[PDB]
Every structure is written in structure tokens, then in C-alpha cells.
Swiss-Prot record, chain A:
Recorded superkingdom: Eukaryota
Cellular localization per UniProt: Nucleus; Chromosome; Chromosome, Centromere
Location of this fragment in the whole protein: 637 to 795 of 1231
Species, as recorded: Homo sapiens (Human)
Residues spanning the membrane: none
Protein name per UniProt: Cohesin subunit SA-2
UniProtKB/Swiss-Prot annotation, chain B:
Positions carrying Phosphothreonine: T36
Source organism, top-level taxon: Eukaryota
Organism: Homo sapiens
Subcellular location: Cytoplasm, Cytosol; Nucleus
Residue window of the full protein shown: 359 to 395 of 631
Record's protein name: 64-kDa C-terminal product
Record region (Interaction with STAG1): 4-37
Biological role: May promote apoptosis.
């Protein structure tokens, strides 16, 4: 983010590099998630480690970078839904998914300011917001104290 | 970590910053513009 300042004449190069990095991360995340959930059989542990590792990087970058063109809300929200439905997901996976989805919602708002977006985008943002709060509430009354702590922080800031 | 918490632990900063740390000034404005008088 410090090297991606527009006023400096390096945005083209740093943006090319940014685009490659985020692209590889996104393709790997989607490919891994397809086999991860899969609805068909039981998942292993090393692939869970890889999924957590990739998500920890996507989340870390989505806090200062507008990773919106690579729409991930579907992926994160699906992952969280399978988590509620089964009740066996890893805690850190839940935490970082719950973080990345807050980030995508916040950036979606960041782009609703120019007024270039139609009324459909505002209603889409409302639809994503109400969906998010509902999932966060359940995760505010979980067994894992780390999960409940992350829920509280995110819910308070969103409100 | 204690240096940071002495930077931001003051209640004036505790009541003017997000709980989940947001680094980009865009998102910081998205939050802090909701801080009225």
C-alpha cells in the first residue's frame, strides 16, 4: 500500500505486480474451496492447512487493497454457511473468513460513494449487510472464545 | 506491542478509532465519518 501511491510514478508497475499476486491467490483459493466443501465426502487436514494459509493472505491484503474485482463474497459466505450447517469447521478458518467478508462489505460501500452505481447496487449492499449480521450473531454465541471475540468486534464496527 | 498500546491506549484514541484495525485511510474515513460531535 505504501508503494501503490498514485502520485508517485510507479503505479503502473506496482499495479501489474499486485494484480498477478492477487490473481494467483484468488485462483488457488477458488480451486481449493471447490474440493474443500464438495458436499460429498469428508475433508482431510493438509488441505485445510492450505486453505487457511491462502485465506490468511487474502484477508491480510483485503484490509489495505481493493480486492473487489475478484469477487469473493460468494466464496466466503458459502464457506461460513457450511460452517453453521455442520458445526465442525476450524476456528481460525472461521475467524479469517469472518474478517474477509467484513472487508469486502466495507469496500463495496467505499465504491457506492461516487454515485456512478445504480439503485440495484445499493439494494445489493443492503442484502449483503443483513445476511452478514445474521451469521455474525450466531458466531457471537459460539463455544470458541476467539471466535466470539472476533464476532463482537466486527458486529460493533459494522453497526 | 506496549509502545503501540501506549500510542492508542488513551481513551481519546479508544473512542476515535475502529476496534478491528483498518489501515487504509479510505476505510478509516468510512468509519470515522460516523463520529458526530
Amino acid at each position: 500500500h505504501a508503494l501503490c501511491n498514485e502520485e508517485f510514478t510507479i503505479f503502473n508497475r506496482v499495479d501489474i505486480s499486485r494484480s498477478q499476486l492477487i490473481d494467483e491467490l484468488a485462483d488457488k483459493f477458488n480451486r481449493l474451496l471447490e474440493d474443500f466443501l464438495q458436499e460429498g465426502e469428508e475433508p482431510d487436514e493438509d488441505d485445510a492447512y492450505q486453505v487457511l494459509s491462502t485465506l490468511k493472505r487474502i484477508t491480510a491484503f483485503h484490509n489495505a487493497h481493493d480486492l473487489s474485482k475478484w469477487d469473493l463474497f460468494a466464496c466466503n459466505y458459502k464457506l461460513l454457511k457450511t460452517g453453521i450447517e455442520n458445526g465442525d469447521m476450524p476456528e481460525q478458518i472461521v475467524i479469517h473468513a469472518l474478517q474477509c467478508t467484513h472487508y469486502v462489505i466495507l469496500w463495496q460501500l467505499a465504491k457506492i460513494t461516487e454515485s456512478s452505481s445504480t439503485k440495484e447496487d445499493l439494494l445489493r449492499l443492503k442484502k449483503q449487510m443483513r445476511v452478514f449480521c445474521q451469521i455474525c450473531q450466531h458466531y457471537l454465541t459460539n463455544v470458541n472464545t476467539t471466535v466470539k471475540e472476533q464476532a463482537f468486534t466486527i458486529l460493533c464496527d459494522i453497526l | 506491542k506496549l509502545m503501540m498500546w501506549k500510542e492508542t491506549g488513551g481513551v481519546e484514541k479508544l473512542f476515535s478509532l475502529p476496534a478491528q484495525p483498518l489501515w487504509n485511510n479510505r476505510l478509516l474515513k468510512l468509519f470515522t465519518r460516523c463520529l458526530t460531535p
